[PDB]
Amino acid sequence: MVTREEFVARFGGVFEHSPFIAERAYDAGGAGLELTAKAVHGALCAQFRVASEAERLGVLRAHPDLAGKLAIAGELTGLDRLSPQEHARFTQLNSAYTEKFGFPFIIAVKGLNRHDILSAFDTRIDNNAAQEFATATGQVEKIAWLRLASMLPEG
């Protein structure tokens, strides 16, 4: 049986720094889920979707920036072969983006090369607040899936 403490411990980080997502999922009957990425992701997205707009904005803002993800990868391990200069460009593009939108540049990165990312910045910096909020929230969900897929059978 999956206790609360364990579920939240567990899946509290799937939406970065957002354990409330996992708490509410648990109160919606989380412990009865099949422990598969499909099941748990559906359950977690459900809470993310139903959270207030302020709360969703909080999730975006807590999400790590790209350079931070790359550095965590560098602790364990063509996004793996970036320049000192290309790392720096990511940092700069991320500063520009957050200065415009008020949250980091969030992008699911599995299978993506450096160009794919530059392309997405290019397109996305030119959107308005409502479009980027749709895209960013989509991407966060995204990342949730990718995280869960590494931890769980898919379903």
Task: Please list the active-site residues.
Answer: 63
DSSP, collapsed to helix, strand or coil, labels residue 35 as coil
Closest to a copy of itself by CB, 21 or 109: 109
Q: What are the helix (H) ranges across the chain?
A: 4-11, 19-27, 37-50, 53-62, 66-76, 84-101, 114-124, 129-151
Min. distance of Cβ 148 from a copy of itself in angstroms? 8
Closer to a copy of itself by Cβ: residue 118 or 152? 152
For tokens 């049986």, what's the residue? 1
Residue position matching structure tokens 């790209």: 66
53/80 with CB nearer a copy of itself: 80
CB of 79 to a copy of itself, least distance (A): 6
CB of 50 to a copy of itself, least distance (A): 23
Which residue number, 115 or 128, has a Cβ lying nearer to a copy of itself? Answer: 115
Cα separations in angstroms, 56 against 21, 43, 81, 83, 140: 10, 16, 33, 33, 10
- Closest among 93, 101, 41, 44 to 65, alpha carbons compared: 93
Residues in touch with a copy of itself (CB under 8 A): 5-6, 9-10, 13-14, 35, 64-65, 67-77, 79-80, 84, 87-88, 91-92, 95, 108-110, 143, 146-147, 149-153
Q: How far is the CB of 130 from a copy of itself (least distance, A)?
A: 26
From the list 59, 57, 61, 8, the residue with the least C-alpha distance to 30 is 8
